[PDB]
Amino acid sequence: SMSVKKPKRDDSKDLALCSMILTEMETHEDAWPFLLPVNLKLVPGYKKVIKKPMDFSTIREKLSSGQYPNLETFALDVRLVFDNCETFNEDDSDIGRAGHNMRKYFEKKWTDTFK
């Protein structure tokens, strides 16, 4: 509350560390469905169904231009990528499986780096 603060968690490396995580996700062999924004002209249903599209290139540009206020808003957009993927793709599809694999990979790196 006013003039009563918990001890200061060191967040000075968060930007560098989120960038490293994102590099690892970018270079994963199963990243290919997520590297670029879904083409809303060429994929029927996407625009109407997926209210907030997100992809790794969009996260990278947001990261690089100070559009994440803290490490939690960064994790929310990464998870959005995988939540969108599960909304639109069957579990038993190459893309559906890719999304599960990547979400697992992410959540481990997240825990090991920050928890």
* Exposure string over 74-88, b if 16+ CB within 10 A, otherwise e: bbebbebbbbbbeeb
Name the experimental technique: X-ray
Domain boundaries, the chain: 1-115
Residues 6 or more apart in contact with residue 47 via CB below 8 angstroms:
40
Instruction: Tell me the residue length of the chain.
Output: 115
For residues 15 and 73, give the distance between their C-alpha atoms in angstroms, rounded to a whole number.
12
Q: Which of 100, 84, 91, 79 is nearest to 49 (CA)?
A: 84
Distance CA 49, CA 44 (A): 10
- Cα 31 to Cα 38, 90, 100, distances in angstroms: 13, 17, 11
Which parts of the chain are beta strand (E)? none
**DSSP structure class, residue 38:** -
- 1-115 maps to CATH 1.20.920.10: yes
